[PDB]
Symmetry: D2
Subunit: 445 residues, 4 copies
Amino acid sequence: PHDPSFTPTQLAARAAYLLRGNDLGTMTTAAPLLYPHMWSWAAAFVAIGLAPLSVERAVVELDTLLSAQWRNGMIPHIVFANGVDGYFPGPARWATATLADNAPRNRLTSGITQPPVHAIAVQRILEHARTRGRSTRAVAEAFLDRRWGDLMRWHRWLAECRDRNERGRITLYHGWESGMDNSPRWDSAYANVVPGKLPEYQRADNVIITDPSQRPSDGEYDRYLWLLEEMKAVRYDDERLPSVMSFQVEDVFFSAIFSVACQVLAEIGEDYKRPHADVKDLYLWAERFRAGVVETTDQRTGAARDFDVLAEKWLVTETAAQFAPLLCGGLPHDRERALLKLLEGPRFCGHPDLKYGLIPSTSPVSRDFRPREYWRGPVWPVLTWLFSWCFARRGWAERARLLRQEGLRQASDGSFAEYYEPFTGEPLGSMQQSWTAAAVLDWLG
Amino acid sequence: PHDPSFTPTQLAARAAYLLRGNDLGTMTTAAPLLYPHMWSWAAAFVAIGLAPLSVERAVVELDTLLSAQWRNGMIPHIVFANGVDGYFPGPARWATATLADNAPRNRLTSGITQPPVHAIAVQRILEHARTRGRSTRAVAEAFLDRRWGDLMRWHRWLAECRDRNERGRITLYHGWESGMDNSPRWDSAYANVVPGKLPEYQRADNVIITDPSQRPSDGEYDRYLWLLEEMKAVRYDDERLPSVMSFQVEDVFFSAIFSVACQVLAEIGEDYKRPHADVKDLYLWAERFRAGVVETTDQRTGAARDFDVLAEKWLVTETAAQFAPLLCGGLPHDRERALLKLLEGPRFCGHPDLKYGLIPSTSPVSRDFRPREYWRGPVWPVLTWLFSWCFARRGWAERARLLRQEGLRQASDGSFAEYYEPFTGEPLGSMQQSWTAAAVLDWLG
Amino acid sequence: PHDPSFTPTQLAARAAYLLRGNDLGTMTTAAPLLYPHMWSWAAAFVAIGLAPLSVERAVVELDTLLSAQWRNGMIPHIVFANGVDGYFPGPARWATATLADNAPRNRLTSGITQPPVHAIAVQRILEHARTRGRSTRAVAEAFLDRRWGDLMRWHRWLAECRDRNERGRITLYHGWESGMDNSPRWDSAYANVVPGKLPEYQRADNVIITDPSQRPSDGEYDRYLWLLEEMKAVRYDDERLPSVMSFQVEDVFFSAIFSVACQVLAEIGEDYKRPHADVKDLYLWAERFRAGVVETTDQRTGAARDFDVLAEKWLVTETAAQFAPLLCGGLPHDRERALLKLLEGPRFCGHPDLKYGLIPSTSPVSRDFRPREYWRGPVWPVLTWLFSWCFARRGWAERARLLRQEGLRQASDGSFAEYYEPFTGEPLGSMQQSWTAAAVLDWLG
Amino acid sequence: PHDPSFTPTQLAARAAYLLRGNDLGTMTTAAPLLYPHMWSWAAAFVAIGLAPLSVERAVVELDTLLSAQWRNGMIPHIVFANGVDGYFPGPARWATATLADNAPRNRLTSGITQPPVHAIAVQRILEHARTRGRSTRAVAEAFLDRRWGDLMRWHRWLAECRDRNERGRITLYHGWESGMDNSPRWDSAYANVVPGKLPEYQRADNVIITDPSQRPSDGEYDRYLWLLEEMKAVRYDDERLPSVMSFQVEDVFFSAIFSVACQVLAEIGEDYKRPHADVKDLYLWAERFRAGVVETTDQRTGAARDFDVLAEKWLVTETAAQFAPLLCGGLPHDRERALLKLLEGPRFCGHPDLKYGLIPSTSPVSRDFRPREYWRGPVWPVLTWLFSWCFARRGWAERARLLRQEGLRQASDGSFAEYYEPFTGEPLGSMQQSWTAAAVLDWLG
């Protein structure tokens, strides 16, 4: 027909329909077939999407994730659904059940972590619950009573075990932990990953998404899977990873998210009278990781750089992660204006060929840009949501509104795509992606 | 908080969330616990609610119902879910699998029928599909190819087997077939039902809805269950029911719905080039049942009367079924103006104590009125939807709009109640009622 | 930027801002500069646009128009604003104040008429007023008390003086009376208009709209002005016009509007207890003009034809006026289905190059089609509104809704254009056109 | 009827209709009859309401106000419409044209000032203009070119002449300059104002608002008018006012607005490349007045106090002005949490009897509270708007959203009242108040 777009009520209805369709009972899959398990930072965004629909079920999603938390406080990036195949690497390949002393009992999980967006989801649940009356507030408050300690142990694990030199940046041992699997950010670190005798495997992801231009290459997957072998060889021991891992990077976007999450969780702790020692620690980490992000920044543009710990070199790339300081604050006034100018100008949101005024995952003017290839170019609704929410929290009400308006216009086809081609708007990756529906529901719920 | 109501997008999202939550896979329950099976006219309204969400799944709902159609064309009023308890009378009590020569193989069903709203759901599916493009139109058109014959056999069974004297009104052998179980319409016919040796039973419905003021009495249930015994004794044989049934009424509201449904299905048959003989028969029945409804009407107010076939007497009651002629048309101009005056005045929608400008199931000024008791007074969103849709089809655009606006205001608490107290707006009956969510979604989808 | 469209709330605000900006006090101009006076059928649409904003001011608009009614009941098509120039032909050219015995005192008007959409405006005012409470209902009821007789005299002058032979169609003496000045409908009748010594003149309309492709030609204006000379020569006397006018046509679209308007006014008359004889006359005229419209129609396609009274021949053209019978009803069932098939097919709303699913003023496949030239092709929001309102009144709820949706999409640029290029959507004619803002306000009010 | 509320589109339409109706040509009256002139801070809010409708007309509103700026930079609080009477005190009473050396030529104005919300209006105009494309941006940029210097002179006159001692707070010589004429804030200072021989007068305000409970008392008006006599006696000379005025107070709410406005104007200055010295002065003033506001605050609760310069004492009252520090920032973290707890608790937004979750002008638990009496208790939409905008700018997105939602709920009756009874929601003061329509338009525009 003359316009395939849905009205706001039709789109909200379809988004909620999707999220309930991806519910296995106590966990929501990240997508129906491509990602048929619970991913950690996806579960946070799913809980945000569920909060306008059912505070009780949003709380269940976070409870299920936190029940898979490791003994040392790490939240693993995948919690596998029982008896579910069609995703590789599955639990057999990770072997955390047999090898990892800290793995949970009676959950199957991966052995790496992912960004700490969870406190943001807790804030959204509390904000919805407070509009819904007493029994709903009681549900959310009982969740805090039950899980405050687990959330603290999660933030403490990050601060103590992935920032062992108190530099205020999080070290990753796998690009998957960044959430941006094949970002140009990691190319030079991955070039220093040399697989040994890698056990044979067959990919599953590109059986579902068959267009090779939309997913990482076989050579990249070989490196992803080899890092798993290096972790397995030391039984996922935190104390041994710095000595054996071929990939060790400080992720400045993860670090900025953690700064925000600490500040958010500290404000929740004050509001709900959690222990003062915990609130103090959270504000201290918020400050430390804010400073750690600012320390990376370009002196002209304010752009944030990742750091290769093995090579001891700043990683300079032109991706959306450069805008990490906008999330957590801390740049001097003049440099933050330069960074906003970069965000809005012809290298990113202002590029003249963009269909929507949204942030591409890699700058279209970078030689690394590929308009279809996962994190090397496409526009991701999940990132649009996170930037809009963080911008509103900075006080940039109009910038946040414009991102939401363009993100809703992009989503109004109802495909709920994982990511979109930046110039044509073609939906790419998995359709029926839960956190894309969640973004739409929060923007409308 | 200061206002518990939801915005239109929040309400649409919650309605879709509910309908997906009630999906068992290929059938949607009418409610989560009170009605944990598929009801026939509920399934039509569920398909209307699904159409803005998934034309494919809306079609599946009707396919599942039609797969339970009896050999003689009857659509039974319940299709039981496999292995589901907590509803009485269940399939053991009906014993149609063992006793009824016309019962379907490999579905379990009841042995009575319910109103033919199904063609209306087919129209809504086609209207949505035509806005959605080629592959979606193909899905809806393939449904017509597959099920046109079954829909014809359903309408033919009603016309030939429940109007055996071609009076243009449908005979019922159970008040449950009217959809209005305990309506005052049936009280005098039920007083002539005398149970014999009624096999012991324990109700299940009032274990879920425990407030006795909201459900029928034990004495009424004894009569409902005795009629089942009379049908079982003749093995549900259509030819034997007139000779043995203690309850035989002509239902003028069912008759008007059938008139509309025949006209709707005839227009679909013309549009999609179905056999001309079928379209002709449908228009003939549309006309016959329109005239049959008009024949019942009060010469002053236009109000339609049911007919007790055993007592040979017009049943004069003050319920929403009086407005049957407004659905199908056919009254002379002056009498239809009088009937609209009755609808809008102080006996119904204009009653000064009503919270919303909606049609109570029984007039608040009738001595039969009970403000909590199922069909004896409460406002039913399903009836608001049906009247609004039929009124729009009469060309009464503003009257239809006002019913929709008030029905949405009533529903904006998000309880999706089965029915509502007419004066206080208190939600009553089952919460999470699928056809209440469907009404909201159609009004917004 | 990326999306120059307005939200529904922004668009409704800017539509109301425009209408109040075109208010001279007691009359609203049809456009700020091109049409700086009150046009008769524009005033009806303006009152519809004002009814959601102020029932009182909506009533004032019709009061002002009726205060300019001629002594014989004719509503003239222009009521000039005092002292305003820049429109031609102005009141000096018409000279009705000096020549026309029936012209109003102390108003200046044109000497021809225009379609009777006024009763539709009265219906919308009453519907709004009934939602606004006792004081607002009193305003609208006082208007009926004060103006019912003038409305009757208007309808009676059309029925008796423009249908002298009781054929059930309205005769026009000028194409301006049709509202479709340069429609292909009138080309063969204008070809027989041979101007004599025409007093010199300078056009004003193409000083404001300078693009010559958007307005009638100079040769066309010469014929328009020559017909004025013929009417002036007989002092605008109804009895003498049939003997002298070079242009005499029966307008089937005007006739169908009149049928609808008579039926609408009759129902208002019944509801507000107006004299029985008036109501009976209105129903008589509604039927007469419904039959008159049907008599013009092609027996296979249903398309309605105009009639050239001087040439005694049916005018066969491919414009939107062919769909006149859809407005008033009366066609046999098969013929109306055929006419709907024409409307929805590739000659009109289904043409593959149309930007919107809307009714072009002339079929894009006609040899007469010109995509920019006034009534020879462009899409007119005022027609979209009239068709969608009449369709909803026929019971065609989905058809009406689709026209409304597409009309709002087209209007969402906020130009409030007089008409739009059918392929590109370019706004054409005057911007800030009052009845385009009124359509938008009604569709959202 | 059952729901006298308007839909968002109807409400936006009626708000725009009202604003255009209050337009005299180049100035908008604050209300049709009670306030038939241009008020200074009302004009800022009016320009905000016009920006979604016409950036050009929004700019004209500020141009007209600035054309009335005094020679020393003061923006007077009233610009009188030519020839308009029915407001008292009018221009003959002020006699600024004859007495005040700095009064404008060929404009008539008052002789006192009002809060500097103008920069906020400029920000909203620019944000709208940037969404509307090149021509509209040029309009708004031309305004900056033409008026940047006048805006600087306005801020510099406040900073240098109303903060002579560089305390970072604005001194007022009349309670009218606060915008909160009869606030309890000023009661102890007015108690020391002893009128001498006051030239006789007749109030006009209580001929329009006759209910005495809604307006200030006669004794209060005598003091207001006596202060005028004191200013006239010294010819409105800035240098002489501190020696003669019986009323001299530092207004912490005005001061916080000024801080915000300086920061807003500085950011505009940086974005549009205005002189570096101006931007540096604006940042200096923003900090000075932020610190000045913080210096007034209770160390436990954060509540800000006004200061009586003549009595040399802090004015401790329980009004909405206590929340001044929330607008401008600067409080220590613990103190701001305490102040938010006061705002949200049972003394203000959390009071159990409030109809809406909105900020009453005086705490309902204060002995000074009067639920109908102007600034002594009622809820003012203009304050709701200002607080919600400032809160969003602080990053408090949910707090801002809740105020907007409740303000729209309250405004959904369409009265556009000046203020509302806090318990019953009764509209009070003038109906058709321009800045109430502006708030609604901004919240929906």
